[PDB]
mmCIF file with all atom_site columns, C-alpha atoms in Angstrom:
data_model
loop_
_atom_site.group_PDB
_atom_site.id
_atom_site.type_symbol
_atom_site.label_atom_id
_atom_site.label_alt_id
_atom_site.label_comp_id
_atom_site.label_asym_id
_atom_site.label_entity_id
_atom_site.label_seq_id
_atom_site.pdbx_PDB_ins_code
_atom_site.Cartn_x
_atom_site.Cartn_y
_atom_site.Cartn_z
_atom_site.occupancy
_atom_site.B_iso_or_equiv
_atom_site.pdbx_formal_charge
_atom_site.auth_seq_id
_atom_site.auth_comp_id
_atom_site.auth_asym_id
_atom_site.auth_atom_id
_atom_site.pdbx_PDB_model_num
ATOM 1  C CA . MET A 1 1  ? 0.276  -0.104  -0.194 1.00 27.69 ? 251 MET A CA 1
ATOM 2  C CA . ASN A 1 2  ? 1.896  2.929   1.468  1.00 28.51 ? 252 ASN A CA 1
ATOM 3  C CA . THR A 1 3  ? 5.763  3.017   2.411  1.00 27.43 ? 253 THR A CA 1
ATOM 4  C CA . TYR A 1 4  ? 6.707  4.498   6.213  1.00 27.75 ? 254 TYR A CA 1
ATOM 5  C CA . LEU A 1 5  ? 10.049 5.698   7.394  1.00 27.20 ? 255 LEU A CA 1
ATOM 6  C CA . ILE A 1 6  ? 11.523 3.387   10.247 1.00 24.90 ? 256 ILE A CA 1
ATOM 7  C CA . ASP A 1 7  ? 14.756 4.017   12.564 1.00 26.91 ? 257 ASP A CA 1
ATOM 8  C CA . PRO A 1 8  ? 14.918 2.274   15.935 1.00 23.37 ? 258 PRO A CA 1
ATOM 9  C CA . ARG A 1 9  ? 16.636 5.190   18.325 1.00 22.93 ? 259 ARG A CA 1
ATOM 10 C CA . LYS A 1 10 ? 16.393 3.230   21.545 1.00 24.09 ? 260 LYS A CA 1
ATOM 11 C CA . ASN A 1 11 ? 18.717 0.952   19.177 1.00 23.74 ? 261 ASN A CA 1
ATOM 12 C CA . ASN A 1 12 ? 21.819 3.247   19.691 1.00 23.76 ? 262 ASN A CA 1
ATOM 13 C CA . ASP A 1 13 ? 22.896 2.334   16.794 1.00 24.71 ? 263 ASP A CA 1
ATOM 14 C CA . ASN A 1 14 ? 25.084 4.517   14.729 1.00 24.64 ? 264 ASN A CA 1
ATOM 15 C CA . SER A 1 15 ? 23.716 3.293   11.195 1.00 24.44 ? 265 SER A CA 1
ATOM 16 C CA . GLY A 1 16 ? 21.954 5.859   10.199 1.00 17.74 ? 266 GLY A CA 1
ATOM 17 C CA . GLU A 1 17 ? 21.167 3.772   7.348  1.00 18.45 ? 267 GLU A CA 1
ATOM 18 C CA . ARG A 1 18 ? 16.932 3.761   8.000  1.00 17.41 ? 268 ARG A CA 1
ATOM 19 C CA . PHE A 1 19 ? 14.723 1.322   6.456  1.00 17.07 ? 269 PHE A CA 1
ATOM 20 C CA . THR A 1 20 ? 10.955 1.516   5.053  1.00 17.35 ? 270 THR A CA 1
ATOM 21 C CA . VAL A 1 21 ? 8.026  -0.578  5.805  1.00 16.97 ? 271 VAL A CA 1
ATOM 22 C CA . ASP A 1 22 ? 4.731  -1.633  4.403  1.00 18.87 ? 272 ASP A CA 1
ATOM 23 C CA . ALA A 1 23 ? 1.642  0.309   5.657  1.00 19.09 ? 273 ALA A CA 1
ATOM 24 C CA . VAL A 1 24 ? -1.918 1.396   4.601  1.00 17.93 ? 274 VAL A CA 1
ATOM 25 C CA . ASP A 1 25 ? -1.595 4.123   7.735  1.00 17.35 ? 275 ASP A CA 1
ATOM 26 C CA . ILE A 1 26 ? 0.766  5.176   9.980  1.00 17.67 ? 276 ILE A CA 1
ATOM 27 C CA . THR A 1 27 ? -0.967 2.992   12.776 1.00 18.58 ? 277 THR A CA 1
ATOM 28 C CA . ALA A 1 28 ? -0.416 -0.117  11.288 1.00 19.41 ? 278 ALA A CA 1
ATOM 29 C CA . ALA A 1 29 ? 2.743  1.281   9.898  1.00 21.28 ? 279 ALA A CA 1
ATOM 30 C CA . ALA A 1 30 ? 4.040  2.080   13.288 1.00 21.37 ? 280 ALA A CA 1
ATOM 31 C CA . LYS A 1 31 ? 2.995  -2.256  14.597 1.00 25.04 ? 281 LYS A CA 1
ATOM 32 C CA . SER A 1 32 ? 4.335  -3.631  11.096 1.00 26.85 ? 282 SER A CA 1
ATOM 33 C CA . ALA A 1 33 ? 7.827  -1.507  11.834 1.00 28.95 ? 283 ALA A CA 1
ATOM 34 C CA . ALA A 1 34 ? 7.856  -2.540  15.476 1.00 30.65 ? 284 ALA A CA 1
ATOM 35 C CA . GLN A 1 35 ? 7.261  -6.286  14.337 1.00 31.74 ? 285 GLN A CA 1
ATOM 36 C CA . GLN A 1 36 ? 10.835 -5.793  12.584 1.00 32.37 ? 286 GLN A CA 1
ATOM 37 C CA . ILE A 1 37 ? 12.946 -4.053  15.041 1.00 30.15 ? 287 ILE A CA 1
ATOM 38 C CA . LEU A 1 38 ? 11.455 -5.885  18.111 1.00 31.24 ? 288 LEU A CA 1
ATOM 39 C CA . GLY A 1 39 ? 11.489 -9.251  15.954 1.00 30.10 ? 289 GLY A CA 1
ATOM 40 C CA . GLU A 1 40 ? 8.347  -11.746 15.858 1.00 30.03 ? 290 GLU A CA 1
ATOM 41 C CA . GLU A 1 41 ? 8.687  -11.701 19.766 1.00 28.78 ? 291 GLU A CA 1
ATOM 42 C CA . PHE A 1 42 ? 6.664  -8.402  19.306 1.00 29.92 ? 292 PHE A CA 1
ATOM 43 C CA . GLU A 1 43 ? 2.717  -8.652  20.028 1.00 30.94 ? 293 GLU A CA 1
ATOM 44 C CA . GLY A 1 44 ? 2.125  -6.039  22.676 1.00 29.11 ? 294 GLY A CA 1
ATOM 45 C CA . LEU A 1 45 ? 0.213  -2.875  21.512 1.00 31.70 ? 295 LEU A CA 1
ATOM 46 C CA . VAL A 1 46 ? 2.033  0.537   19.587 1.00 31.09 ? 296 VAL A CA 1
ATOM 47 C CA . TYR A 1 47 ? 0.555  3.885   20.789 1.00 32.10 ? 297 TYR A CA 1
ATOM 48 C CA . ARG A 1 48 ? 1.587  7.107   19.854 1.00 32.18 ? 298 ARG A CA 1
ATOM 49 C CA . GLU A 1 49 ? 4.966  8.827   20.838 1.00 32.25 ? 299 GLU A CA 1
ATOM 50 C CA . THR A 1 50 ? 4.764  12.142  20.436 1.00 30.85 ? 300 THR A CA 1
ATOM 51 C CA . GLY A 1 51 ? 1.257  14.178  21.475 1.00 31.90 ? 301 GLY A CA 1
ATOM 52 C CA . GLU A 1 52 ? 2.101  18.199  22.405 1.00 31.89 ? 302 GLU A CA 1
ATOM 53 C CA . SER A 1 53 ? 2.152  18.647  18.459 1.00 28.95 ? 303 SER A CA 1
ATOM 54 C CA . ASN A 1 54 ? 0.678  16.661  14.990 1.00 29.78 ? 304 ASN A CA 1
ATOM 55 C CA . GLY A 1 55 ? 4.116  16.238  14.098 1.00 32.46 ? 305 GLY A CA 1
ATOM 56 C CA . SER A 1 56 ? 4.795  12.387  13.120 1.00 34.44 ? 306 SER A CA 1
ATOM 57 C CA . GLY A 1 57 ? 8.026  10.653  12.775 1.00 30.54 ? 307 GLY A CA 1
ATOM 58 C CA . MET A 1 58 ? 8.223  8.997   16.244 1.00 34.19 ? 308 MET A CA 1
ATOM 59 C CA . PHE A 1 59 ? 6.101  6.420   17.904 1.00 35.11 ? 309 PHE A CA 1
ATOM 60 C CA . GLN A 1 60 ? 6.165  3.889   21.061 1.00 37.36 ? 310 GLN A CA 1
ATOM 61 C CA . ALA A 1 61 ? 6.328  0.249   21.133 1.00 34.69 ? 311 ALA A CA 1
ATOM 62 C CA . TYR A 1 62 ? 5.257  -1.985  24.004 1.00 35.60 ? 312 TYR A CA 1
ATOM 63 C CA . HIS A 1 63 ? 4.978  -5.731  25.093 1.00 38.26 ? 313 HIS A CA 1
ATOM 64 C CA . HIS A 1 64 ? 4.963  -7.560  27.860 1.00 38.95 ? 314 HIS A CA 1
ATOM 65 C CA . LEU A 1 65 ? 4.636  -11.666 28.015 1.00 35.86 ? 315 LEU A CA 1
ATOM 66 C CA . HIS A 1 66 ? 1.717  -12.605 29.423 1.00 36.68 ? 316 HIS A CA 1
ATOM 67 C CA . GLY A 1 67 ? 1.273  -16.622 30.450 1.00 36.04 ? 317 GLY A CA 1
ATOM 68 C CA . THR A 1 68 ? 4.193  -18.336 30.774 1.00 33.29 ? 318 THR A CA 1
ATOM 69 C CA . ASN A 1 69 ? 5.024  -15.545 33.296 1.00 33.61 ? 319 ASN A CA 1
ATOM 70 C CA . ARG A 1 70 ? 9.201  -16.163 32.618 1.00 33.36 ? 320 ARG A CA 1
ATOM 71 C CA . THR A 1 71 ? 10.176 -12.361 32.391 1.00 37.30 ? 321 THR A CA 1
ATOM 72 C CA . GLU A 1 72 ? 8.804  -9.397  33.861 1.00 38.27 ? 322 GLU A CA 1
ATOM 73 C CA . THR A 1 73 ? 7.958  -8.062  30.570 1.00 36.15 ? 323 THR A CA 1
ATOM 74 C CA . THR A 1 74 ? 9.536  -8.674  26.874 1.00 38.48 ? 324 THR A CA 1
ATOM 75 C CA . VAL A 1 75 ? 10.043 -5.609  25.387 1.00 38.78 ? 325 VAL A CA 1
ATOM 76 C CA . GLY A 1 76 ? 8.984  -1.639  25.798 1.00 36.83 ? 326 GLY A CA 1
ATOM 77 C CA . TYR A 1 77 ? 10.840 1.076   23.660 1.00 36.56 ? 327 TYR A CA 1
ATOM 78 C CA . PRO A 1 78 ? 10.118 4.271   21.486 1.00 37.00 ? 328 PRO A CA 1
ATOM 79 C CA . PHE A 1 79 ? 11.053 4.378   17.623 1.00 36.79 ? 329 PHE A CA 1
ATOM 80 C CA . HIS A 1 80 ? 11.197 6.773   14.904 1.00 36.29 ? 330 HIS A CA 1
ATOM 81 C CA . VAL A 1 81 ? 8.118  6.138   12.048 1.00 40.23 ? 331 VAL A CA 1
ATOM 82 C CA . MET A 1 82 ? 7.197  8.461   9.491  1.00 40.54 ? 332 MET A CA 1
ATOM 83 C CA . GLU A 1 83 ? 5.237  8.633   6.213  1.00 40.16 ? 333 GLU A CA 1
ATOM 84 C CA . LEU A 1 84 ? 7.079  8.263   3.228  1.00 40.03 ? 334 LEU A CA 1
ATOM 85 C CA . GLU A 1 85 ? 7.450  10.951  0.551  1.00 39.61 ? 335 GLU A CA 1
ATOM 86 C CA . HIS A 1 86 ? 3.471  11.772  -0.364 1.00 40.45 ? 336 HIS A CA 1
ATOM 87 C CA . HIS A 1 87 ? 2.087  13.780  -3.343 1.00 39.90 ? 337 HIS A CA 1
#
């Protein structure tokens, strides 16, 4: 449908090379991006990182392992997310 820019900030990696993910809306793009950044191990939920401003390009992805209680929380960190150049 549409491409969305994805850049893992929490990663703290020194790789400016950002990757893009497929999606229909920023809402879904974020959920799809996290699945790649955090991996298939990510099944929690995503939410908007910013609020005071509509300026997109940032989102939050959280996930807590429920059932096995093997850990306290699977993953949970922010991540850049913005819709590629449009018309």
